[PDB]
Amino acid sequence: RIKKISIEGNIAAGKSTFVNILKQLSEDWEVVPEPVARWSNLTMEQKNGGNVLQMMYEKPERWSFTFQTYACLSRIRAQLASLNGKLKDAEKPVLFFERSVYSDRYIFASNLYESESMNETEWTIYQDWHDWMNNQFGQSLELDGIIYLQATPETCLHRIYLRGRNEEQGIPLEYLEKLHYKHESWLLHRTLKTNFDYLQEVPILTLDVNEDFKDKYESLVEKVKEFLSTL
Amino acid sequence: RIKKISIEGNIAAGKSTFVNILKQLSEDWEVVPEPVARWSNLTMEQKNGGNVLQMMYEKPERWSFTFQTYACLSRIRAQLASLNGKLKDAEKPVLFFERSVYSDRYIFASNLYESESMNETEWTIYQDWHDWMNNQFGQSLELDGIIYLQATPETCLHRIYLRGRNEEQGIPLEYLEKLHYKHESWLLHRTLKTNFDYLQEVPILTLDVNEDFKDKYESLVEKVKEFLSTL
Numbered sequence: 001r002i003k004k005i006s007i008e009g010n011i012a013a014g015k016s017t018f019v020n021i022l023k024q025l026s027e028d029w030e031v032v033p034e035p036v037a038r039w040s041n042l043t044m045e046q047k048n049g050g051n052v053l054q055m056m057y058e059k060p061e062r063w064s065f066t067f068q069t070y071a072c073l074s075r076i077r078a079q080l081a082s083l084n085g086k087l088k089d090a091e092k093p094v095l096f097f098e099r100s101v102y103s104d105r106y107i108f109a110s111n112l113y114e115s116e117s118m119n120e121t122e123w124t125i126y127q128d129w130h131d132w133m134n135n136q137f138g139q140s141l142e143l144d145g146i147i148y149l150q151a152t153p154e155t156c157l158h159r160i161y162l163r164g165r166n167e168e169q170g171i172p173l174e175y176l177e178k179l180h181y182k183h184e185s186w187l188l189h190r191t192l193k194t195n196f197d198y199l200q201e202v203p204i205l206t207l208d209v210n211e212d213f214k215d216k217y218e219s220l221v222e223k224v225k226e227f228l229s230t231l
Numbered sequence: 232r233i234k235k236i237s238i239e240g241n242i243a244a245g246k247s248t249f250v251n252i253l254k255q256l257s258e259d260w261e262v263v264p265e266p267v268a269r270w271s272n273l274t275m276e277q278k279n280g281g282n283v284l285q286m287m288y289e290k291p292e293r294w295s296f297t298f299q300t301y302a303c304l305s306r307i308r309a310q311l312a313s314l315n316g317k318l319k320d321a322e323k324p325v326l327f328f329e330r331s332v333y334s335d336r337y338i339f340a341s342n343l344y345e346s347e348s349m350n351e352t353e354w355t356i357y358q359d360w361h362d363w364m365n366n367q368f369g370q371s372l373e374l375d376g377i378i379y380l381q382a383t384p385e386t387c388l389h390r391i392y393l394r395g396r397n398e399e400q401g402i403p404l405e406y407l408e409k410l411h412y413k414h415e416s417w418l419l420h421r422t423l424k425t426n427f428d429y430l431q432e433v434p435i436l437t438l439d440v441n442e443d444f445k446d447k448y449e450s451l452v453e454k455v456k457e458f459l460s461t462l
């Protein structure tokens with residue numbers, strides 16, 4: 001009954017800002033933030049995530065698999081818990097996912113493999129887990145639609161300094177460009193091959209979010225509302 | 232419907248010997264062989280198995296987390312298969328697991344952590360991963376009984392050569408000595424309090440497999456049948 005919409009976008013694309021805006025508008029609207037985001041600041045996960053985040057930065061080809069599996073584990077666990085608890089007795093329930101399990105695997109896990117931070121065995125193992133996981137663990141999480149907060153890797157680099165996380169300051173431009181490339185394959189050119197069948201027939205809303213929208217987001221919300229009404 | 236029993240014991244204790252004996256004595260009885268043992272001798276899982284297994288020996292401090300995660304997952308999957316693809320409408324169906332998800336954690340993963348082949352984060356993430364993998368996927372796997380095969384480290388080292396595998400050939404005796412202790416404490420002495428409360432209440436049969444029983448096992452088997460009638 002609860003519709004699941006994933007908000008996809010590059011680093012500092014403005015996903016957290018967009019969903020914070022979206023959540024306030026409708027009582028029937030809720031949001032599952034990306035678990036990794038809370039790691040970048042006390043649970044067992046926070047400490048585990050905190051440590052594994054720092055280790056990841058420091059030595060990626062040692063910690064990509066560990067980080068990536070734990071990241072996706074946490075996402076699934078958070079998104080399931082939001083499905084149960086949140087949005088009780090609402091008439092038109094919408095759950096906005098800050099990124100999805102598919103961005104976990106087909107963007108960030110994929111990028112780390114191709115940037116050699118995971119060897120073949122690790123990539124093969126991760127995928128096998130991921131594939132199996134989303135059958136005997138994460139069936140109810142399948143998306144109804146996708147909101148692609150589309151922006152150039154140039155725009156994204158601009159917004160990284162604005163938030164000021166003494167770790168992301170080190171993130172370069174070619175990195176953004178490769179993440180962007182993989183977004184467009186999956187979400188604009190709809191190129192990317194995925195083992196998930198229903199994804200090829202999942203509605204996608206692409207929003208150009210290069211122009212600042214923090215105080216001017218009505219046009220964006222209007223599209224989302226229009227997008228939702230066709231689901 | 233299906234009785235689920237875990238056959239436990241140190242490396243080369245005789246577990247595979249015993250389960251293949253049990254196998255041919257009844258069509259109510261079926262076996263779920265161990266993945267890690269299956270890896271040691273090739274599908275997608277087996278191709279991954281051999282590699283991480285091979286790397287696990289070359290560098291335990293690098294690959295223990297990765298190995299323990301895939302071994303447990305490949306086990307959870309494998310016993311799930313038998314549990315849903317066997318013993319249909321059988322009159323007294325029993326399934327004999329070669330080790331369990333508890334052996335994975337509290338025997339092997341725990342000892343690798345103790346041997347500093349996993350750091351705190353890897354080990355805590357695994358425990359986090361373990362708690363949730365087994366509940367949000369493997370509830371139907373709860374054990375109705377455990378059968379402990381007890382052998383000396385010397386007996387095992389023997390049999391390691393007898394079995395042949397030069398990938399495990401000169402397994403240090405002291406390795407066998409520590410695994411032996413963790414088995415003893417969990418199953419016999421019962422000091423090990425797991426995170427699965429019911430394990431402290433699950434009945435345990437203990438069998439001495441020091442003596443060659445390959446052509447003389449009727450006594451052991453009689454104890455199994457008596458044991459099964461209690462469950």
Ligand SMILES: COc1ccc(-c2nc([C@@H](C)Sc3nc(N)cc(N)n3)c(C)s2)cc1OCCNS(C)(=O)=O
Pocket residue numbers: 034036053056057058060068071072103104105108109115171172174175176
């Ligand atoms: C060479 O060292 C690296 C060190 C760290 C990274 C990191 N990527 C990330 C995330 C983008 S991975 C991630 N996975 C998810 N599943 C979700 C999510 N939000 N983030 C870090 C937190 S750290 C990536 C690195 O390299 C990427 C390839 N080389 S590069 C930066 O373009 O010169």
Ligand SMILES: COc1ccc(-c2nc([C@@H](C)Sc3nc(N)cc(N)n3)c(C)s2)cc1OCCNS(C)(=O)=O
Pocket residue numbers: 242265267268284287288289291299302303334335336339340342343346403405406409
């Ligand atoms: C130091 O080099 C090692 C090299 C290989 C291992 C291996 N352990 C194993 C298994 C016994 S771990 C295992 N975990 C499972 N979950 C299941 C299973 N069947 N086996 C291998 C297949 S390889 C273990 C190693 O050290 C383990 C600790 N030795 S010690 C003397 O206690 O410090």
Ligand SMILES: O=c1ccn([C@@H]2O[C@H](COP(=O)(O)OP(=O)(O)O)[C@@H](O)[C@H]2O)c(=O)[nH]1
Pocket residue numbers: 009010011012013014015016017018159160162163211212213214
């Ligand atoms: O329309 C926008 C979009 C982004 N930002 C800034 O860009 C940064 C990105 O923040 P956010 O966490 O939302 O990016 P995310 O990683 O979630 O995509 C923040 O400092 C925002 O203040 C902004 O000022 N206006």
Ligand SMILES: O=c1ccn([C@@H]2O[C@H](COP(=O)(O)OP(=O)(O)O)[C@@H](O)[C@H]2O)c(=O)[nH]1
Pocket residue numbers: 240241242243244245246247248249390391393394440442443444445
């Ligand atoms: O009573 C026995 C049990 C074991 N074996 C041999 O010891 C080796 C290791 O036994 P097993 O694989 O059953 O031990 P596991 O590791 O499976 O617990 C095998 O080659 C068996 O042929 C034996 O000779 N007599």
